[PDB]
Design a protein around this motif. Structure first.
Motif, PDB file in Angstrom:
ATOM      1  N   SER A 132     -67.388 -34.722  27.918  1.00  0.00           N
ATOM      2  CA  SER A 132     -67.577 -36.068  27.411  1.00  0.00           C
ATOM      3  C   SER A 132     -66.845 -36.244  26.090  1.00  0.00           C
ATOM      4  O   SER A 132     -66.445 -35.272  25.445  1.00  0.00           O
ATOM      5  CB  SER A 132     -69.066 -36.374  27.228  1.00  0.00           C
ATOM      6  OG  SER A 132     -69.726 -35.304  26.577  1.00  0.00           O
ATOM      7  N   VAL A 187     -70.189 -30.641  27.007  1.00  0.00           N
ATOM      8  CA  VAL A 187     -69.493 -30.555  25.736  1.00  0.00           C
ATOM      9  C   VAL A 187     -68.980 -31.952  25.398  1.00  0.00           C
ATOM     10  O   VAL A 187     -68.360 -32.619  26.238  1.00  0.00           O
ATOM     11  CB  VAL A 187     -68.364 -29.514  25.780  1.00  0.00           C
ATOM     12  CG1 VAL A 187     -68.972 -28.138  25.822  1.00  0.00           C
ATOM     13  CG2 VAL A 187     -67.500 -29.693  27.009  1.00  0.00           C
ATOM     14  N   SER A 188     -69.288 -32.427  24.196  1.00  0.00           N
ATOM     15  CA  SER A 188     -68.848 -33.742  23.748  1.00  0.00           C
ATOM     16  C   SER A 188     -67.899 -33.560  22.578  1.00  0.00           C
ATOM     17  O   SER A 188     -68.172 -32.781  21.659  1.00  0.00           O
ATOM     18  CB  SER A 188     -70.024 -34.632  23.350  1.00  0.00           C
ATOM     19  OG  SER A 188     -70.776 -34.041  22.311  1.00  0.00           O
ATOM     20  N   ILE A 189     -66.790 -34.282  22.622  1.00  0.00           N
ATOM     21  CA  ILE A 189     -65.663 -34.060  21.731  1.00  0.00           C
ATOM     22  C   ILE A 189     -65.500 -35.289  20.849  1.00  0.00           C
ATOM     23  O   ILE A 189     -65.326 -36.407  21.352  1.00  0.00           O
ATOM     24  CB  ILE A 189     -64.385 -33.762  22.523  1.00  0.00           C
ATOM     25  CG1 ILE A 189     -64.550 -32.422  23.234  1.00  0.00           C
ATOM     26  CG2 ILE A 189     -63.184 -33.748  21.616  1.00  0.00           C
ATOM     27  CD1 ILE A 189     -63.762 -32.289  24.484  1.00  0.00           C
ATOM     28  N   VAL A 190     -65.555 -35.078  19.536  1.00  0.00           N
ATOM     29  CA  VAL A 190     -65.448 -36.176  18.585  1.00  0.00           C
ATOM     30  C   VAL A 190     -63.986 -36.569  18.445  1.00  0.00           C
ATOM     31  O   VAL A 190     -63.116 -35.713  18.240  1.00  0.00           O
ATOM     32  CB  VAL A 190     -66.051 -35.765  17.235  1.00  0.00           C
ATOM     33  CG1 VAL A 190     -65.823 -36.848  16.194  1.00  0.00           C
ATOM     34  CG2 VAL A 190     -67.530 -35.445  17.390  1.00  0.00           C
ATOM     35  N   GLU A 191     -63.704 -37.861  18.579  1.00  0.00           N
ATOM     36  CA  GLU A 191     -62.337 -38.330  18.418  1.00  0.00           C
ATOM     37  C   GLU A 191     -61.906 -38.197  16.962  1.00  0.00           C
ATOM     38  O   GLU A 191     -62.731 -38.381  16.057  1.00  0.00           O
ATOM     39  CB  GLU A 191     -62.206 -39.783  18.868  1.00  0.00           C
ATOM     40  CG  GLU A 191     -62.067 -39.940  20.361  1.00  0.00           C
ATOM     41  CD  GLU A 191     -62.022 -41.388  20.783  1.00  0.00           C
ATOM     42  OE1 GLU A 191     -62.431 -42.251  19.980  1.00  0.00           O
ATOM     43  OE2 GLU A 191     -61.578 -41.668  21.915  1.00  0.00           O
ATOM     44  N   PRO A 192     -60.642 -37.871  16.694  1.00  0.00           N
ATOM     45  CA  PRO A 192     -60.201 -37.699  15.304  1.00  0.00           C
ATOM     46  C   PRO A 192     -60.165 -39.016  14.550  1.00  0.00           C
ATOM     47  O   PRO A 192     -59.936 -40.079  15.130  1.00  0.00           O
ATOM     48  CB  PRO A 192     -58.798 -37.101  15.451  1.00  0.00           C
ATOM     49  CG  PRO A 192     -58.344 -37.539  16.793  1.00  0.00           C
ATOM     50  CD  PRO A 192     -59.564 -37.584  17.655  1.00  0.00           C
ATOM     51  N   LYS A 193     -60.402 -38.931  13.246  1.00  0.00           N
ATOM     52  CA  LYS A 193     -60.103 -40.026  12.337  1.00  0.00           C
ATOM     53  C   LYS A 193     -58.596 -40.236  12.329  1.00  0.00           C
ATOM     54  O   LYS A 193     -57.835 -39.276  12.172  1.00  0.00           O
ATOM     55  CB  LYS A 193     -60.619 -39.697  10.940  1.00  0.00           C
ATOM     56  CG  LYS A 193     -62.130 -39.614  10.844  1.00  0.00           C
ATOM     57  CD  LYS A 193     -62.576 -39.283   9.430  1.00  0.00           C
ATOM     58  CE  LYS A 193     -64.090 -39.188   9.339  1.00  0.00           C
ATOM     59  NZ  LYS A 193     -64.540 -38.859   7.960  1.00  0.00           N
ATOM     60  N   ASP A 194     -58.157 -41.476  12.519  1.00  0.00           N
ATOM     61  CA  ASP A 194     -56.728 -41.765  12.536  1.00  0.00           C
ATOM     62  C   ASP A 194     -56.139 -41.596  11.136  1.00  0.00           C
ATOM     63  O   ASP A 194     -56.379 -42.406  10.235  1.00  0.00           O
ATOM     64  CB  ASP A 194     -56.479 -43.158  13.125  1.00  0.00           C
ATOM     65  CG  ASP A 194     -57.299 -44.256  12.455  1.00  0.00           C
ATOM     66  OD1 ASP A 194     -56.843 -44.837  11.449  1.00  0.00           O
ATOM     67  OD2 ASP A 194     -58.412 -44.537  12.947  1.00  0.00           O
ATOM     68  N   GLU A 195     -55.407 -40.501  10.943  1.00  0.00           N
ATOM     69  CA  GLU A 195     -54.907 -40.141   9.628  1.00  0.00           C
ATOM     70  C   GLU A 195     -53.609 -40.879   9.316  1.00  0.00           C
ATOM     71  O   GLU A 195     -52.949 -41.446  10.191  1.00  0.00           O
ATOM     72  CB  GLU A 195     -54.696 -38.632   9.530  1.00  0.00           C
ATOM     73  CG  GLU A 195     -53.676 -38.079  10.506  1.00  0.00           C
ATOM     74  CD  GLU A 195     -53.239 -36.673  10.150  1.00  0.00           C
ATOM     75  OE1 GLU A 195     -53.980 -35.718  10.465  1.00  0.00           O
ATOM     76  OE2 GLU A 195     -52.156 -36.522   9.549  1.00  0.00           O
ATOM     77  N   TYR A 229     -55.847 -33.742  19.887  1.00  0.00           N
ATOM     78  CA  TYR A 229     -55.937 -32.587  18.977  1.00  0.00           C
ATOM     79  C   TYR A 229     -54.907 -31.515  19.302  1.00  0.00           C
ATOM     80  O   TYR A 229     -55.118 -30.342  18.987  1.00  0.00           O
ATOM     81  CB  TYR A 229     -57.323 -31.936  18.955  1.00  0.00           C
ATOM     82  CG  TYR A 229     -58.344 -32.655  18.133  1.00  0.00           C
ATOM     83  CD1 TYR A 229     -58.076 -33.001  16.825  1.00  0.00           C
ATOM     84  CD2 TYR A 229     -59.553 -33.050  18.683  1.00  0.00           C
ATOM     85  CE1 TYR A 229     -59.007 -33.661  16.065  1.00  0.00           C
ATOM     86  CE2 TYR A 229     -60.478 -33.733  17.938  1.00  0.00           C
ATOM     87  CZ  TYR A 229     -60.209 -34.029  16.628  1.00  0.00           C
ATOM     88  OH  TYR A 229     -61.149 -34.699  15.882  1.00  0.00           O
TER      89      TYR A 229
END
Lengths: 359, 65, 122
Positions: A6, B46-54, C19
């Motif tokens: 997810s 599993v959960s995936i945090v999206e990146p902060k747009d740098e 990533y």
RNA sequence: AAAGUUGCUGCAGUUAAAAAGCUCGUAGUUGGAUCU
RNA sequence: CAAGACGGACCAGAGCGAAAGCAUUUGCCAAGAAUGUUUUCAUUAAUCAAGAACGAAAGUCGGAGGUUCGAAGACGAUCAGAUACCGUCGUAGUUCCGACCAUAAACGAUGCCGACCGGCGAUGCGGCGGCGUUAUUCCCAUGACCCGCCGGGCAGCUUCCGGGAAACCAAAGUCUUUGGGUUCCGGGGGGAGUAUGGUUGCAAAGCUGAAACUUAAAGGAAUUGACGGAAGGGCACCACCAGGAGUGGAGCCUGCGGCUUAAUUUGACUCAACACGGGAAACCUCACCCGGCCCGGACACGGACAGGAUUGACAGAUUGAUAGCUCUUUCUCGAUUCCGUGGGUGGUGGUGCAUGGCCGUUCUUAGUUGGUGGAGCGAUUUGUCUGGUUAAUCCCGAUAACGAACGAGACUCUGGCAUGCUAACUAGUUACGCGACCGGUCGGCGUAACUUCUUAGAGGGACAAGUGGCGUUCAGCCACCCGAGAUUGAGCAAUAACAGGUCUGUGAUGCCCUUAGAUGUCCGGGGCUGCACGCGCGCUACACUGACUGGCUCAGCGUGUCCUACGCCGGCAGGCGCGGGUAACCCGUUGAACCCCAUUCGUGAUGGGGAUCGGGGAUUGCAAUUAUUCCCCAUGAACGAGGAAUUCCCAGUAAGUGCGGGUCAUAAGCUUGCGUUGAUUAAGUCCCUGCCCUUUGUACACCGCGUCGCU
């Protein structure tokens, strides 16, 4: 929506000081109250005039909405194999044109399942006992006395035969004491016997697709034929009087309903053991030469000592010398006979190879 | 997970015809316990945090702070 | 034997897909940054995800990937894509042409071209 | 009556019932344009 | 040489013919389509009751000739029953002439004539125009070629025109938006193309052709696959190879049968029953038998009862029983009741085929199912695969599919690793001191540290990670370095199921049966264990790699308010006293066994091995009689490696060896676990068996049960 792998949108979430705000925490409880739709209507007695009310808001008898809800509730009392859904939570106005079809299908489905269940429920042996009683009533056997020996493949019963009053010139003489061997047809362990049945040319085309009862009948017929061949050559064996299906009647070996003792159970002297070994060798030579068959099950139990003579029994597994395993079976029988004779102290007993060469 | 998410509860009900058995297996959800649900998630999700747009580099900037 | 399942392969795929920059062909550098991003359960799942990430970036060096789609493609394939030669292959000094095509050109009022050379179908 | 399961309106005829073995041919039926 | 036959190869989705049919050269006779025509008539036409010519093969009359093949017929093989089957001969026929017959799956299962509606290029015939090639460069036309075009043909390919129930058809189209012309012919399936009648034919038979009655279906397309014994592929030490231990061969224990018994409760009967029902039973257990005791019959009605309903009872008789259980004895007790009518309770009493729950099995497998999208009217199908890949529908990649969820995996417990962390007087070491003995030993004593050993919590660590090959160079497979581990062992376990076991585990339970000389409760005794015999586990052995004795010397689970230390008496079993331990504090440093050294025995049914049997002793228990156990002499028997067949197992594994727990007042030959010693072989297959899985076909057809008898 439901995936294991997810994605999380945490970084795009801006401000959340008080996450547990009292807007999404509404306590939804309607089951034990009177607000749940899944509750009986407490039915009113049937009106006689056929309607409720008057004027324009006259609620009639069938009243398609009411009748649809009623037909949904009548669906709720179907067969357990039926699947309904959530027909009370969602307002389901189901009509008789549809409900009667579904009701007919429920009846047909339950009825066909009942038919399948009823077909499933509709699916010495008693037939052997009936055959023995018919043979006893026919005058062939006077009385079934008892069981002499119980084998893995067949049961041997000692009995007294009857005196046939029919003065036929070709009538066989019935012995006073008879042994009836009934092949066991309720045992599934008889599977290796095809190693000694399919190799015979006299019954290969019949045993290629025979039933187990037919296989037992063919084995009994082969045993009767082997006994007749042994009696024709003068070998000491029980003379078969009559064979019926899986039951073969032969002459009993003994006296006063006592079976003849086996060679292993007989405590014979050294001269008696030498005479028994010589008689066994002569019988094996006569079977190999005159009877043209190999016993293939020759051992101490297969040979009985009676009146100073060796008698051979259990010739159901006997095969001809032309079989592909006749020579190996004859060698094994000769080795077993040589071992039994050497165990008895017979110094004149030849070796297995010498006995095989002499036979 | 079948030890601390599903809540198996077997009960017997006595009717005119006889006895009926009832099994109700309710699986608890996530969102750790503000009076609801266990802490740890299902041991597979599993959960995936999206990146902060740098900020992409355009010009080397030295700002004294 | 030892075949990676659906969850670990799909997780490694989405870890490559976004990533891609912060990870690398070195193994253990991936391991911790997986923990820094995906709130993952056991360490057997973690050390199995971080294995396929290294095994997939070793596979990247052999060319494209049939399963992932990000529009970065290293920095060389972008350079390879916009390659421009010094001389156009279309401005040919002389072109061999069929008389039927020259008849089409003459009918097209384009009969005064100079780079054409009429060849015969021998 | 539903029957478009008697079909002029208005049924069908390769495989579900069904096109003659084929051709000639009388009675029957229908017959190219063309005259304000 | 003669006799008749038939014209293969050339022979094609080619040609001709109205159809049936039609291939050897040459000649004769008329026919015929298409083409070409600024030719002639001018509506002469299309379809057709009656009527007529032709009509394969088979058949029928006369004649001819008869190679071959051949119905009939004659032989031989083949068998529980062959008379179909096969090979040998052989008549009519098959051949020609002249007359009948007039039927075929005579088919395109698709009448004839006319118009229109997509495309394409091959082929036959005729005609037209040509870049050009060949007749040894042909001297000009001309045949054989090539590129096109036209008309009429036999066919083909492709299409979401259109139609159809669909298979499919460019006609089966231009059809509820229903009319170009015309002939035949069908009306649920049988009876039946049968009877009767008419007519044709020598005849066989042809044409025409019902009814009574009987039946609710018969029939056409297409979909899934039960099922294949049809085939291959695939997996399994509950299968095999190589092997190890065996079992089956003895003795004994235990369980299940049978045989007895008053009863030898009871269920379970291939794997999926048979040391299972925690089911190793002195009473209890205990359901069973032989006999007694009690109401522990709530509650409602009626009767009895205070001038007593009753309870309990000493002594004697009976009684195994200070069983008032009954009699005599007459003492107690103040409604706590009693007798019937009702219906409540108690059942280890019946139905697991009425049930729940639990458990077992298919299966410790390899599948199960939606959502959206595509195809089809719809059943349905793709997704759920060509292939590769794995322990895994685990995965890769193709791809009208894209994404999912359950299962597998992940997870949880345990094991191997941490000289990094946490911290120990209920654990251990080191140092120092105190000793004791001869600088060495002390589990022999106390305080400094300390966490290596011991504990048990966090965190770390191992992922096909790196390397070399293999690879559809993807997924992944073999080998190697480094590493403690390149990886153990279990728990949980999907969809769909089973008349699997359990009412006997429940104050789970529906219908019930009984309920006061009770199927309820309790007590006494017996029995579950009784033995001619059979079937399954298991334990001892068959001796020398062994047995006896002495000495030596190491564990781990894990119990314990009963576990036990220590001292004393006894030869042992045991007994007495004083202690500790409600527990890493005590048993205990758990001085376990196998094993290690030495002595004796030396192939002998031998001292191997102790089945059977006597006597004594001690403990536990009310009660050991049916030896409960344990101990000491004596008795020493089968058994000398085991037939057919069969079980289990791949690495701290099998085997060998003992310890703990459960059962337990008394107790393990069982079982659950635990260490100790520690292997052989193989790392491969479908040869047995079992289970899969894919493809194709796919929703009991036919020829081979009767004789007589009277009303």
């Amino acid at each position: 929506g439901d995936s294991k792998v997810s994605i999380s949108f945490e970084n795009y979430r801006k401000v959340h000081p008080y996450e547990d705000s009292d807007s999404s925490e509404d306590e939804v409880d309607w089951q034990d109250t009177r607000d749940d739709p899944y509750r009986p209507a407490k039915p009113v007695p049937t009106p006689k005039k056929g309607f409720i009310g008057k004027g324009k808001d006259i609620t009639t008898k069938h009243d398609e909405v009411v009748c649809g809800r009623k037909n949904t509730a009548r669906m709720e009392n179907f067969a357990p194999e039926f699947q309904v859904g959530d027909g009370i939570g969602m307002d389901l106005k189901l009509s008789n044109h549809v409900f009667n079809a579904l009701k007919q299908h429920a009846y047909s489905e339950e009825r066909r399942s009942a038919r399948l269940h009823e077909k499933k429920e509709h699916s010495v042996d008693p037939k052997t006992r009936l055959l023995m009683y018919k043979m006893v009533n026919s005058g062939m056997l006077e009385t079934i006395t008892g069981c002499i020996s119980t084998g893995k493949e067949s049961v041997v019963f000692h009995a007294y035969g009857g005196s046939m009053e029919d003065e036929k010139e070709d009538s066989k003489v019935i012995p006073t004491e008879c042994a009836i061997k009934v092949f066991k047809t309720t045992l599934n362990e008889f599977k290796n016997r095809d190693k000694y049945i399919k190799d015979d040319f006299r019954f290969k085309d019949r045993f290629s697709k025979l039933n187990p009862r037919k296989i037992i009948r063919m084995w009994a017929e082969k045993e009767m034929h082997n006994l007749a061949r042994m009696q024709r050559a003068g070998i000491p064996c029980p003379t078969v009087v009559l064979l019926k299906k899986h039951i073969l009647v032969m002459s009993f070996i003994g006296h006063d309903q006592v079976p003849a003792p086996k060679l292993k159970e007989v405590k014979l002297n050294s001269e008696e053991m030498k005479e028994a070994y010589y008689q066994t060798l002569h019988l094996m030579r006569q079977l190999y030469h005159e009877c043209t068959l190999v016993h293939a099950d020759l051992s101490e139990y297969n040979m009985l000592w009676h009146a100073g003579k060796v008698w051979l029994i259990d010739v159901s597994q006997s095969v001809e010398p032309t079989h592909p395993h006749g020579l190996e079976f004859l060698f094994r029988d000769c080795r077993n006979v040589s071992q039994f004779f050497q165990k008895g102290g017979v110094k004149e007993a030849l070796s297995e190879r010498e006995l095989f060469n002499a036979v | 997970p079948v030890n601390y998410y599903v809540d198996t509860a077997v009960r017997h009900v006595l009717l005119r015809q006889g006895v009926l058995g009832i099994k109700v297996k309710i699986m608890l959800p996530w969102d750790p316990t503000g009076k609801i649900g266990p802490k740890k998630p299902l041991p597979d999700h599993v959960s995936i945090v999206e990146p902060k747009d740098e900020i992409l580099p355009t010009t080397p900037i030295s700002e004294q702070k | 034997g030892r075949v990676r399942t659906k969850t670990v392969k799909k997780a490694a795929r989405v870890i490559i897909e976004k990533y891609y920059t912060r990870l690398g062909n070195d193994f253990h550098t991936n391991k911790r940054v997986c923990e820094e991003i995906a709130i993952i359960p056991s360490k057997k799942l973690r050390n199995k995800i971080a294995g396929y990430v290294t095994h997939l970036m070793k596979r990247i060096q052999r060319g494209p990937v049939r399963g992932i789609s990000i529009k970065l493609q290293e920095e060389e394939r972008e350079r390879r894509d916009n390659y421009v030669p010094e001389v156009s292959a279309l401005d040919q000094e002389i072109i061999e042409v069929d008389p039927d095509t020259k008849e089409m050109l003459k009918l097209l009022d384009f009969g005064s071209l100079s780079n054409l050379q009429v060849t015969q179908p021998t």
